[PDB]
């Protein structure tokens, strides 16, 4: 085997890494790093290229050039280099310092998080998601835990990561966490954006009231509730949650993909239209 990218040695000789770890699953650890030179603070996620004994630097390669046809997009994390080892591959990233969007979730912090910055959250996750579905391109696994925040006090802008399940529209489809998955998926029905969407649905849901809205005592249950779209709509759950709100989850959670609005329509929706207060509004009748 052969390398591609920049050699391990100028990475330690670039970059030092900080204690701060962020992130570690199976086949990947995410670990802040800072440049020598100019001290800025990145995030470095180094990606295993075997896996269960299989080959993987195909796929990895597949997920760089994604990024790189998003770069231009605010709402998704920017990729700054490229290193490579015997066993890894390294991608240096912009550093979202607020965290996961997953945080704002709990009961704990539930305090904090007023309306109005949830109406301009959903607003930035559609913008990232229109962009993308433009292009053909479908994330398929928009969990609050792969959407993060750029700060936390004050409250920052969305940034987009993971896209290690992309596709194009069409491809073949079984596997995460249950809670999150389409019932397309479990039907084995063909890829498609409405995929998204319904991934969407689940975010602002969880944003409003904090509490999981398929998760079940085990997991036979939570394929139940999905394939039968049980959901919790009760007085005591949405007591402080406004129609148009309720409105815009409802569209969303729906079994038949084909009626699912789009992205571009669900950015037209009531709920999300607000004038900031702080503008001279221009009425319809002129002086
Ligand atoms: N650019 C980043 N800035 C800050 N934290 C990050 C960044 N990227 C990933 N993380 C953190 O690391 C965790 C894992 O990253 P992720 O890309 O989702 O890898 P995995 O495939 O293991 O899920 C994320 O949940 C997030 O908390
Ligand atoms: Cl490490
Ligand atoms: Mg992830």
Known sequence: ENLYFQ???????????????????????????????????????????????QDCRAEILHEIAVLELAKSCPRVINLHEVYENTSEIILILEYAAGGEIFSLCLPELAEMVSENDVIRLIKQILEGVYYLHQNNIVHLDLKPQNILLSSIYPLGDIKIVDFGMSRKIGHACIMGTPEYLAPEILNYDPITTATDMWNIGIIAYMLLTHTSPFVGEDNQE????????????????????????????????????????????????????QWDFENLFHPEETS
Request: hydrophobic share 35%; glycine share 4%.
């Open 7 to 53: 050699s391990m040695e100028n990475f330690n000789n670039f970059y030092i890494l900080t204690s701060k770890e962020l992130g570690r699953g199976k086949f990947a650890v995410v670990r802040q790093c800072i440049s020598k030179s100019t001290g800025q603070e990145y995030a470095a996620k180094f990606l295993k290229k075997r896996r269960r004994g």
């Open 222 to 273: 939570t394929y139940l509730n999905i394939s039968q779209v049980n959901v919790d709509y009760s007085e005591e759950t949405f007591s402080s949650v406004s129609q148009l709100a309720t409105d815009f989850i409802q569209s969303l959670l729906v079994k038949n993909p084909e009626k699912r609005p789009t992205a571009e329509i669900c950015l037209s929706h009531s709920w999300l239209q």
